[PDB]
Amino acid sequence: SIAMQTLKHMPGHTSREVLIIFSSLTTCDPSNIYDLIKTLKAAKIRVSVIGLSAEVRVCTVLARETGGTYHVILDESHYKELLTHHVSPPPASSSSEC
Amino acid sequence: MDDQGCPRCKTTKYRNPSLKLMVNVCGHTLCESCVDLLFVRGAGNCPECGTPLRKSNFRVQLFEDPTVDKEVEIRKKVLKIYNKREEDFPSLREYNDFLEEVEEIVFNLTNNVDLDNTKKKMEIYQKENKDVIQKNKLKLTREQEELEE
Amino acid sequence: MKLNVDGLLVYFPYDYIYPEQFSYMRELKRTLDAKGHGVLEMPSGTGKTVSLLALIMAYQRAYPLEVTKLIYCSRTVPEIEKVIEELRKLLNFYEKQEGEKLPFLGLALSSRKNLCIHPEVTPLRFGKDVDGKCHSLTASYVRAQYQHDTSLPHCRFYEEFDAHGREVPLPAGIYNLDDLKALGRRQGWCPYFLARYSILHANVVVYSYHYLLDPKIADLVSKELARKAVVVFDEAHNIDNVCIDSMSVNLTRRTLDRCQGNLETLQKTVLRIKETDEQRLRDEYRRLVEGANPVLPDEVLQEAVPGSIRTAEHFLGFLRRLLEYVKWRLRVQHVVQESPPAFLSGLAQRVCIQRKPLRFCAERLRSLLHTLEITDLADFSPLTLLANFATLVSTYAKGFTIIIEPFDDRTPTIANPILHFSCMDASLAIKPVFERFQSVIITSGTLSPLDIYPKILDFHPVTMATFTMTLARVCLCPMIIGRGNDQVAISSKFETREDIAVIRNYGNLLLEMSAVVPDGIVAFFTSYQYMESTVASWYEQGILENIQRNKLLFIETQDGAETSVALEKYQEACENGRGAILLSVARGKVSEGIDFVHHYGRAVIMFGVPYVYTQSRILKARLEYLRDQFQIRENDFLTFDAMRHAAQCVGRAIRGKTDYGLMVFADKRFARGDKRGKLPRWIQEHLTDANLNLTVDEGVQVAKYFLRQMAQPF
Ligand code: SF4
Ligand SMILES: [Zn+2]
Ligand SMILES: [Zn+2]
Numbered sequence: 001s002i003a004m005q006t007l008k009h010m011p012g013h014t015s016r017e018v019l020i021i022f023s024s025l026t027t028c029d030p031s032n033i034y035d036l037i038k039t040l041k042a043a044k045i046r047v048s049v050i051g052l053s054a055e056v057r058v059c060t061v062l063a064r065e066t067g068g069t070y071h072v073i074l075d076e077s078h079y080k081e082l083l084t085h086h087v088s089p090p091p092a093s094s095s096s097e098c
Numbered sequence: 099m100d101d102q103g104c105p106r107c108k109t110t111k112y113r114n115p116s117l118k119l120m121v122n123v124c125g126h127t128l129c130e131s132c133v134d135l136l137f138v139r140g141a142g143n144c145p146e147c148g149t150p151l152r153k154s155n156f157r158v159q160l161f162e163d164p165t166v167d168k169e170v171e172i173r174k175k176v177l178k179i180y181n182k183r184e185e186d187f188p189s190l191r192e193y194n195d196f197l198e199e200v201e202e203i204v205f206n207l208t209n210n211v212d213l214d215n216t217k218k219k220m221e222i223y224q225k226e227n228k229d230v231i232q233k234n235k236l237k238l239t240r241e242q243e244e245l246e247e
Numbered sequence: 248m249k250l251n252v253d254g255l256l257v258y259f260p261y262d263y264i265y266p267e268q269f270s271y272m273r274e275l276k277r278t279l280d281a282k283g284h285g286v287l288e289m290p291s292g293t294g295k296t297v298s299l300l301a302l303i304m305a306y307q308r309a310y311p312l313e314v315t316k317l318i319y320c321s322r323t324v325p326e327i328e329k330v331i332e333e334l335r336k337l338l339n340f341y342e343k344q345e346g347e348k349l350p351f352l353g354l355a356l357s358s359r360k361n362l363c364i365h366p367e368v369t370p371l372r373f374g375k376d377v378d379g380k381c382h383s384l385t386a387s388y389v390r391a392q393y394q395h396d397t398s399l400p401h402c403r404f405y406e407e408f409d410a411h412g413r414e415v416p417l418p419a420g421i422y423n424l425d426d427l428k429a430l431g432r433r434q435g436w437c438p439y440f441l442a443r444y445s446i447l448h449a450n451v452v453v454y455s456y457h458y459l460l461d462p463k464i465a466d467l468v469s470k471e472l473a474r475k476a477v478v479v480f481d482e483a484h485n486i487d488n489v490c491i492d493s494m495s496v497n498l499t500r501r502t503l504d505r506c507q508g509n510l511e512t513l514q515k516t517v518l519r520i521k522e523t524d525e526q527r528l529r530d531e532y533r534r535l536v537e538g539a540n541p542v543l544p545d546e547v548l549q550e551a552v553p554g555s556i557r558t559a560e561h562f563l564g565f566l567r568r569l570l571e572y573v574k575w576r577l578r579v580q581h582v583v584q585e586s587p588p589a590f591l592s593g594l595a596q597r598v599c600i601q602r603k604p605l606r607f608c609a610e611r612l613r614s615l616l617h618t619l620e621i622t623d624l625a626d627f628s629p630l631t632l633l634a635n636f637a638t639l640v641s642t643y644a645k646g647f648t649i650i651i652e653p654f655d656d657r658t659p660t661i662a663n664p665i666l667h668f669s670c671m672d673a674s675l676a677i678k679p680v681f682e683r684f685q686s687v688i689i690t691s692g693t694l695s696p697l698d699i700y701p702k703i704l705d706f707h708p709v710t711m712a713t714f715t716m717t718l719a720r721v722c723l724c725p726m727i728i729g730r731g732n733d734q735v736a737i738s739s740k741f742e743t744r745e746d747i748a749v750i751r752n753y754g755n756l757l758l759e760m761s762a763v764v765p766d767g768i769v770a771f772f773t774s775y776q777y778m779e780s781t782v783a784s785w786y787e788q789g790i791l792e793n794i795q796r797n798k799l800l801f802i803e804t805q806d807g808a809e810t811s812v813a814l815e816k817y818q819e820a821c822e823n824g825r826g827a828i829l830l831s832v833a834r835g836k837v838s839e840g841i842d843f844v845h846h847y848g849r850a851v852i853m854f855g856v857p858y859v860y861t862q863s864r865i866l867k868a869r870l871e872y873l874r875d876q877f878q879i880r881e882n883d884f885l886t887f888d889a890m891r892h893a894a895q896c897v898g899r900a901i902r903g904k905t906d907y908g909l910m911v912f913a914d915k916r917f918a919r920g921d922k923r924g925k926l927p928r929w930i931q932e933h934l935t936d937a938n939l940n941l942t943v944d945e946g947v948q949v950a951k952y953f954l955r956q957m958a959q960p961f
Contacts, residue, residue, distance in 0.1 A: 025765050025766065025824070025826065026797065026798060026824060026825065026826060027823065027824025027825065028824075028825065029823075029824070032823065033823065033824070034822070034823075051958070053763065053951055053954075053955065054763075054765045054954065054958075055765055055907075055954060055957065055958035056765055056766065056824060057765065057766050057767070057821065057822070057824075057846035058766070058822065058823055058824040059824070060846075071958075071959070072955060072958030072959060073955070074955055074956075074959065099578065100578060160575055161571050161575060162571075162574075163567070163571055165567070166567060166568060166571045169564060169567075169568065170568070170598060170599065173599045174599065177599060190551075190552070191536070191552075193552070194552050194553075194554050194555055194557070194604075197554070197555035197604070198555060198557045198558075198561075200555070201555055201556075201557075201561045201564075202561075205560060205561070205564065245592065
């Protein structure tokens with residue numbers, strides 16, 4: 001929600017992206033996150049989680065539904081690879097506009 | 099023992115259930131502590147009904163239903179008659195027809211006058227007592243002894 | 248995907264099949280070719296159904312005369328719905344391949360309560376209520392009165408079906424239960440009776456066991472028409488228990504009192520009938536002289552003559568006598584008594600009730616009660632239960648036993664004693680299925696070793712093969728933890744149950760496992776009392792609060808409403824990131840009914856080997872009789888009863904679609920060779936000695952690493 005509030009007023013041309021480095025599999029939230037997923041899809045904010053030591057289901061659906069990618073750290077060397085991969089700009093999909 | 103108690107006296111049965119029903123020609127609930135009550139005065143008379151009893155007409159039973167008490171006792175006496183085995187009759191219907199008449203006799207004796215039943219039973223006595231009653235009566239002990247083991 | 252099976256060519260809808268599927272199809276075809284009953288096990292909850300159905304369809308096409316039809320039975324209606332979905336997909340695939348419709352029919356039967364279109368019976372949900380109401384509406388009396396067309400609610404759907412469906416059968420198609428309700432509404436016919444008639448001409452019929460095992464209702468629809476049909480039972484490893492339940496009848500004091508009251512109503516109704524209509528209803532006596540459903544199977548059932556009970560009064564007196572005998576025999580306070588033949592002999596001696604007249608008691612009850620034009624059978628149902636018991640006991644006691652419990656368990660003194668008539672061997676009740684049908688395939692998942700099943704159920708199997716799931720990835724990584732952080736034996740023995748250290752080890756293991764495991768976890772205990780004791784000890788200590796912090800915790804209770812609400816919330820917890828830890832009992836109906844899939848019950852935890860209490864006397868008859876006959880050791884059968892149950896309650900996570908998941912058994916007993924051997928092959932072969940007896944910490948670490956491996960894509 002904080003990221004959405006800041007990114008809502010961002011220009012349409014630029015690609016809004018979020019990389020959640022998830023560590024604790026639990027997610028205690030005041031409101032259901034599935035509802036927030038709808039707003040994220042409407043706002044075309046790409047969310048690509050990187051889980052740690054856990055294949056979290058809610059973040060699996062978050063990544064695939066919102067268009068981002070989900071991954072889990074095999075080890076530190078693979079962690080470097082994952083973040084370096086996310087460095088590069090992501091391809092623009094049909095929802096993306098220029 | 100689940101009965102609330104005697105039509106007369108229920109203190110004993112409410113508390114401890116050792117007392118057992120006593121069967122009578124009245125088909126009529128009674129309890130030992132009240133059997134003494136009947137022995138002292140009348141000596142074989144139902145308290146409310148006043149039905150006469152030859153010698154106390156008392157035998158231990160444990161069936162709360164008085165109708166069942168009378169029905170079972172009457173059936174016990176009836177079984178002494180018409181005890182011929184089924185295989186004695188090759189006819190398919192005759193296997194259970196006579197049992198139908200036996201059940202009719204039991205029900206007739208329970209409520210309706212037993213004069214006709216007694217006269218009929220005398221007729222059946224004169225014929226069955228010669229062979230069938232004696233044979234089945236003797237074979238009852240044999241079959242029971244084999245069945246028990 | 249056409250597979251060139253050894254026997255023939257078999258179509259298949261999905262693109263690829265694992266080698267276990269090839270082995271399954273070839274073994275199944277071998278059994279079908281031998282035309283002999285057999286048993287086989289397949290790991291996957293889903294996939295086996297499609298392979299089995301496709302192979303049966305192809306075999307039907309190749310040798311239509313060999314197999315008349317397929318009778319595929321499933322545990323529960325919610326489960327059999329998924330089977331009809333699979334069959335519909337297969338039929339659409341085959342129809343597209345052929346380019347045209349073929350004379351193939353497939354349908355599922357279900358209770359009138361589950362499916363019906365009459366608004367009056369819609370609001371009520373009780374099965375007995377629906378049965379009684381439908382019997383009233385469809386009663387021969389209601390039908391004859393409908394011919395008169397008098398002002399009275401008559402159920403038009405059955406009448407219209409009689410007029411139309413009798414003339415025209417449904418051409419073909421696949422109809423789910425829900426869709427069949429819509430068809431019945433549209434055509435003004437019964438979704439129930441229409442399917443019942445289609446059973447005569449249906450290629451595939453699917454219904455639960457109680458539609459095919461209990462002689463009361465199974466026989467009528469499983470008549471000899473299917474002389475040579477492929478009957479298949481799916482996931483029917485708990486077949487002995489259900490087959491026993493189909494025979495066991497429980498008599499209680501409250502039920503007996505209700506029976507007495509109902510009998511009083513019966514007598515009053517008979518008097519009213521005599522004063523109102525006597526001759527027309529007396530014609531029943533004539534037809535009786537010539538000579539709720541009977542519980543006697545095909546050959547055991549007899550219909551020579553009703554016996555000495557030829558009139559309403561005589562039969563009512565007979566029921567009074569038998570009910571009095573049962574009432575007193577139950578009121579006796581004493582140790583548990585067993586008396587299979589002696590009970591019949593004592594009944595006959597004490598109350599003068601011959602076994603032959605007692606044999607036809609229930610059948611004559613059905614006929615005589617029909618004569619009375621009663622409002623419904625729901626009110627008199629307890630009397631019918633007692634009548635079924637009355638006829639069964641006089642029918643046979645060679646492989647049965649009457650157990651009397653003046654005192655119930657869990658109560659030092661209770662005024663509601665119960666008389667059980669539990670069976671001891673399931674072969675008696677399942678004999679007609681094997682004998683009538685040319686071949687029966689008991690396909691099961693999580694099946695404990697097949698060798699016992701022929702001993703329990705008297706049949707000569709053709710094939711005995713265990714199929715191991717093979718995938719490019721190790722979907723399942725089971726483990727057994729017997730040593731805690733204290734290196735202390737953690738066996739959940741009866742004498743070791745009270746041990747606070749063992750309870751603490753279980754709590755700590757659950758805490759760490761919930762910390763590392765992703766959302767969704769289910770823990771199965773051995774009993775409600777044991778689960779409550781462990782929960783209370785954890786509550787007294789701080790372990791439970793920490794588990795609550797780490798993840799949400801839900802618990803199971805005997806009450807179905809609370810169970811349903813808790814599970815409904817558990818699913819939402821699994822969907823969200825909170826996660827959930829569902830504590831349940833292995834024997835709990837929730838464990839058997841529920842199915843765990845991807846992101847549901849990710850890590851299945853088994854707290855203690857599931858063993859039934861060694862005091863329930865019913866199991867004593869069931870067990871010692873198996874020792875005497877079929878020569879099964881008491882310990883052997885007991886451990887089998889534990890391993891089969893545990894495999895049932897731990898085999899859910901591998902449902903289908905290759906969804907990862909780990910099965911952890913927190914009991915050193917599972918580490919014993921006998922338990923491992925009796926464990927299903929597919930799980931055991933994955934299990935290895937390296938992880939056989941991991942400590943709590945070591946198991947947690949390996950679980951974390953395995954979850955890491957499964958997280959990444961193929
Ligand atoms: S006759 Fe058919 S429609 Fe009427 S209550 Fe019975 S099942 Fe329902
Ligand atoms: Zn008295
Ligand atoms: Zn009297």
